[PDB]
Design a protein around this ligand. Structure first.
Ligand code: NAD
Ligand code: NAD
Ligand code: NAD
Ligand code: NAD
Ligand code: ADN
Ligand code: ADN
Ligand code: ADN
Ligand code: ADN
Lengths: 430, 430, 430, 430
């Protein structure tokens, strides 16, 4: 293994206890599936933010029988204490806060041997997937990949369309219990957290520009508005844009507010959102950040190349002075601000996300000599069955004291579903 | 025709001038498609709440070339000046506020005769499923219908029950489950039209009250939001753990009706299911508890039991009945359990109804124009194509002054869609 | 008496049974003070919107022993079934919906005669100041009035102008500035009754629209909140930097009417000032812009200019006038600039009006019982004592099921108040 | 001086730059009053949280001519970098994070000499005021004190009532621009910040108990609800309690929710809110914190004395194990959580607060041989004049782009104020 400081493992372990209590879903799967060991002999290479919450996931997969080796999926997201807690325990992990792109891909390469290869992939952003497929040989050897975020799943569909998807892929992001909770309610808390730990800026009164209005944009807009920001939103999709208008947000172009906005938040999963056209027009000390998976939503390379002064205010906060004499504050060098300047999403919402990930791995690994998840030419992307999506939500109601009504036989019949569900048809959007 | 009072045509013509300006989408289809007349030949049997909004829909269909005959799909939903205006214009309408069950039935049968030729309709446009049921189960139109478009969740639920049972003979387009309907009309429509119905009915203060919203689907989401916006403390009931986790995560107590039945001042039923508010709840309610339904059918509330077992019933005003129970305490029932927004107010505002009714126009066009293309065999349920979903939304941005960002080619390639969309994959939940 | 239609007494009696159950505070004063009759001798001249809520106020005063004569303080605010019920009960009322300016004037003069003795009133109860102005400037009652209680901000503003000018002769109790009035009625009342007036008037969608709220006092705060709750993008105008910073800090753009006059779909004037929406604004407005006022007098809007300079005026329905301007575009004016909540709807709900009208009962009791104690010389403006402010609030908690913590002696000593309060210093702003 | 680490001054200075930009009010007073030196020879002993924001205040008072010596007012609130930045500059400061009660009062004693005494007091919480008055001789020597928070001002009024107020006191907390901004909007951002930096807990879904519903409680409740918490509120005041009910919060007793609440937040400024009666009933890992000025709102001494295990999770987060085997997480040992576990209120809102503080010091110090602020027997508590309250708000509108409307002479006359204000009568509550 390799982590910043192994001494921090003790502190890491103390917080994993509190993290475990806040993740009743992951812990119940540990009770339920621990004994039967559904991932007996699984060899999972994981590429996903090395947080305290991922620490609980990792320890679940090992509890369910899996061998596992881990790397972060971002150079700033690793929490040095969670990594050290995993390392002290003996699960091979290669992650620390502040990796170079070279060290990053080094860490990811360490997880693809020494089990000896992996036979399963667990990924957040598609870097591992693309790498295993395009740079190794692991196309007779890997039985499935579980993909956690929208940009990675986009990646997966570009491969299916092209004819290059060689292994079955589970689309975890698009579980209702991931997509409409993690992406939405997670960012609604973890965006402002990163902004505030970085800059301690007052949100109340400010004009914020939120680019994109999908699940991430929805959450980020609701958070900023909640603290008294006036939020304006940009969009390319007429539907998402109209959702934003009907929720009371102005929908305009970045150019329309670039000179007046105090805060710029990128949420699209698309590159070149905030560019060389925008930077020189920004007000003094306009804070610029991104919460989408890749930093290239912001032209940071341009900012660095064209700024006249750069000051590290503190780690993951760079204050640039432009040729016009005004300042730009960039957060986490454009990397995911919630994970880079704070601790990401709280444990409780990641319990939903990671439950789907555990269920996904069980689905693909246990059914490996089944033909239910075909290899090679005919490999395709799948979702978790809706029954399992419901199971995950049901596992998280108790902690909150939410009480569920039970359908009578006549009611289930009238609605056209089973008494124990699934309750909605597969096209339902929640 | 058959309306209450034809001298209300003048007043309805005046409001339709305001309705037209609030429905840019429908008026923009009137301009785009009227010259070519794509529903020429079309003989539409219509069964949808006869409001001012539907009047702009009915005149769009006739501008597009269709012959049309209409009836309201609820006994108390007609706006009498709406029907009077359409009736003067020469369109056959059978609809008044306060139809008995007998009279309601007669009106529907009128819409299935009196076309040109041995003019039996060749098309259906449905809200709730009743017309579809009557035509397929009881009329003879066996060889004569090329499609049905279905407006609501309850009506669509029946279509899927029929298809499942091998009894769907005519192709059906699911309009409710267009994104620009379900995530707009069901949600934002109810967010404004629910409290409108309650207040016009009772003038009651929302702020400070305890309100039990039963169900937390698209309609339940909207109602809870509306009540909470006015300072109600809203508690939610759900059978679905996913919807329940959403409500919990938005700040609402999720409990059983029985947990709040003694303290709630307001009960709203939004389920699309029967026997939510029953004989076991009614005698437990606090004095002057307001009970209403905004689901399609009234049998979410056991109103027959209420009527059978009340000691006293008083009409405060039409559609507001105050019952005295055996216990001496009172229950205020709205619209006899009928959709309260349409029953005690005017239904959703025009602007949102423009989203829904655009979908209905493009669905009728899609079904009818492919009536000799063999694309919808006379039998499945279909969705409007996402391209047309987006179009609907795009037509409504201008009125609000919302501006849409345009993707570059690099950007569209990177996110895997055309520069002009569809922008999202078919399973996206918005 | 003089009402529109006395056969509406029956319908009004039925609604007053619901109003009574929604006004626990007024009904609790009826029980507490009725036995002792503390307003015995009292001859109250009343000038306050003749609604169902005021009917419960008028019957409380008469239960308390007072003789009372009433007139509405606005031409379109009367609820005709409210007046019909009070008129049947034997109380002299002069009030109908749609009084001319002549007729309005006659009704007020009726309330100043016909008491017992050479029965000139000995008390005034005012909303807006007009009765106070008429009695003091133009009637003879010079030796005969022991007090006036003033309901609203505009009326109270006049009382302070008079006191300043050395023209206040009768003691005045400022009821508007009780906390349980100003921070409740003005705020929460308008939060529900504004959109009620707009929607009953126009059925217009709020969601998605741009609304200009002019003024951000207690009424402005409520209106903006209401519009925003439904997905309006609200912009605010203010002359006061403190109120402006509040609106900015709550997420609202603070700008000049001229900055949004061309794009706003909805203008609300809440200032208590004249010439907010003027001849310079009207010709600039978008087609079918909705203009209304919820301030006391209509002259916040230059309606005379509008009427003088419109090419066309059309009555969509009573109190909804659609003007065609020289430019060909339309303006929708509500209630001819009169208070839109009372003009196009029913005013604030009963429950909040119970807070305000309790204050009015305890103010009349305070003034009248000290009518031979020399406490209010016949001349200053006064406030209800904070003890009675708190009492009003305390009377309304039960209905909502709110529970109040009780201070220990140690705790009351530590925060420097009695165990039973007053709990706050006289300058506390809540 | 004495601070943790003088080396941190550099980092401290970099952030004071960003803090200055975010405090346009303080910086404008520095421009306006810098030249004339209104505090020429002032000798200000300051007892107020030694944050980055206080650093900007301190440097303003020195810019305006004052000598100044500083101590924190809480043992956990000092930001070691801001203190070091002040110390490097040469302003005597005695503060570090993690002072003992002995070291704390040592630091406060250092500020009352070496100018040689002070002649002015600047205080947050009343510890300095009480000390200077009850333990020194500085009753011929001190010309005025400026008091920043509600509990200190309470203290001041207990002294006035008793007859022990010997020097004029400026009540800064009760400036509208302090009370209704700092207390309200400040806590609305800085509460969740402290909770999240401490525990990274998910707010969405949780039941939070907020004790008190004054300005602090209002903000804290709005913040928690904003992230999807279900917030219940406790109160002793019927008015504040009814405000909470009408905003949609349950109002109940701590005993009513003690077993189910995930988070307990104390906001009263009263002791013994969360006690030995509550601790043993709390759910596993219930988070307990206080945001009021003194930690004695929570019985921490009891918790420590009766818990079976205590673990420092990390600095300012103690996890206690109770005799029942369940856990309590206590934040900042019960001290102000926003300052103790985070960075307090953002700079922009503290600019309002500290502008009143600068204006206050100028008012008392410049008018020292005036008799406007009488010494000894007849000393009384004063507010800032309303003109100056408005000035402070006006200084903060620009940064936000808020545009103020200018009254015409007729409008100012009609409203009964000057064109340049003050705009409201002194009883106005905003
Ligand atoms: N930071 C985190 O902890 C975390 C969590 C979840 C998701 N994500 C990431 O966030 C990103 C977005 O995820 P999502 O679920 O919201 O995706 P999404 O598809 O739901 O939303 C993205 C939105 O951006 C819009 N868009 C595309 N190009 C645009 C342009 N140039 N300008 C304005 N809008 C544009 C799309 O139309 C879409 O609605 C992805 O990169 C995903 O991997 C990060
Ligand atoms: N009044 C209107 O103008 C209007 C508008 C749109 C839709 N509708 C109607 O409203 C109803 C709801 O529509 P929707 O789109 O929200 O449907 P939906 O399926 O999304 O929501 C209904 C919800 O009720 C829940 N439910 C079912 N039985 C329950 C029970 N016994 N107790 C608690 N919850 C239960 C389901 O889990 C579901 O989430 C339908 O009947 C639809 O036709 C009315
Ligand atoms: N319709 C109702 O049922 C109802 C209820 C209560 C009060 N009112 C009336 O509503 C009005 C407002 O009451 P309030 O309690 O909010 O008064 P308020 O003094 O608190 O608020 C009025 C606000 O308007 C601002 N203002 C003044 N002139 C302005 C201008 N030209 N442009 C922009 N802003 C300007 C002021 O600064 C002030 O903050 C009064 O006339 C009052 O009598 C009506
Ligand atoms: N942490 C910070 O950065 C900061 C900022 C501002 C104020 N404060 C402090 O916060 C505290 C409150 O300030 P505020 O301005 O809200 O005061 P406030 O008087 O407006 O509010 C306190 C409320 O608590 C209520 N109360 C008293 N005893 C109670 C009891 N035992 N149970 C429930 N409620 C009770 C009162 O009725 C009152 O409404 C003070 O100690 C003040 O110094 C701290
Ligand atoms: N805390 C987190 N851990 C892992 N992945 C995340 C997190 N937040 C967002 N994505
Ligand atoms: N106004 C309306 N017209 C037709 N159908 C509706 C309406 N509102 C909800 N459903
Ligand atoms: N309903 C009402 N009755 C009297 N006065 C009012 C009302 N609403 C606002 N002001
Ligand atoms: N940041 C802060 N600085 C000084 N005092 C405060 C602060 N927050 C609350 N009170």
């Amino acid at each position: 293994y390799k982590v910043r400081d192994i001494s921090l493992a003790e502190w890491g372990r103390r917080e994993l206890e509190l993290a475990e209590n806040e993740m009743p879903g992951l812990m119940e799967l540990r009770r339920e599936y621990g004994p039967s060991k559904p991932l007996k002999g699984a060899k999972i290479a994981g590429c996903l933010h090395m947080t305290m919450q991922t620490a609980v996931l990792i320890e679940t997969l090992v509890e369910l029988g899996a061998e596992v080796r881990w790397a972060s999926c971002n150079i700033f997201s690793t929490q040095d204490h969670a990594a050290a807690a995993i390392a002290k325990r003996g699960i091979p992990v290669f992650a620390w806060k502040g990796e170079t792109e070279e060290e990053y891909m080094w860490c990811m390469k360490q997880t693809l041997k020494g089990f000896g290869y992996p036979n399963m992939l667990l990924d957040d952003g598609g870097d591992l997937t693309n790498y295993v497929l395009d740079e190794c040989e692991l196309d007779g050897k890997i039985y499935g990949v579980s993909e956690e975020t929208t940009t990675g799943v986009k990646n997966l569909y570009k491969r299916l369309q092209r004819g290059k998807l060689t292994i079955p892929a589970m689309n975890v992001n698009d579980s209702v219990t991931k997509s409409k909770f993690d992406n939405l309610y997670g960012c609604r808390e973890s965006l402002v957290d990163g902004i505030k730990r970085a800059t301690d800026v007052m949100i109340a009164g400010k004009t914020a520009c939120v680019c994109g209005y999908g699940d991430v944009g929805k959450g980020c807009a609701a958070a900023l508005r909640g603290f008294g920001a006036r939020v304006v939103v940009t969009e390319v999709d007429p539907i998402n844009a109209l959702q934003a208008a009907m929720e009371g947000y102005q929908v305009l172009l970045v150019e329309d507010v670039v000179e007046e906005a105090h805060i710029f938040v990128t949420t699209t999963g698309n590159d070149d959102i905030i560019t060389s056209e925008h930077f020189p027009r920004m007000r003094d000390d306009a804070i610029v950040c991104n919460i989408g998976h890749f930093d290239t939503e912001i032209q940071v390379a341009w900012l660095k190349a064209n700024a006249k002064e750069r000051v590290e205010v503190k780690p993951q906060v760079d204050r640039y002075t432009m040729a016009n004499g005004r300042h730009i504050i960039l957060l986490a060098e454009g990397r995911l601000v919630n994970l880079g300047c704070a601790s990401g999403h709280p444990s409780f919402v990641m319990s939903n996300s990671f439950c789907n990930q555990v269920l996904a791995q069980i689905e693909l690994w246990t059914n490996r000599d089944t033909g239910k998840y075909p290899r090679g030419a005919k490999a395709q992307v799948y979702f978790l069955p809706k029954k399992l999506d419901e199971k995950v939500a049901a596992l998280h109601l108790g902690k909150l004291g939410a009480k569920l009504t039970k359908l009578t036989p006549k009611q289930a019949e009238y609605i056209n579903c089973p008494v124990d569900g699934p309750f909605k048809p597969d096209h339902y959007r929640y």
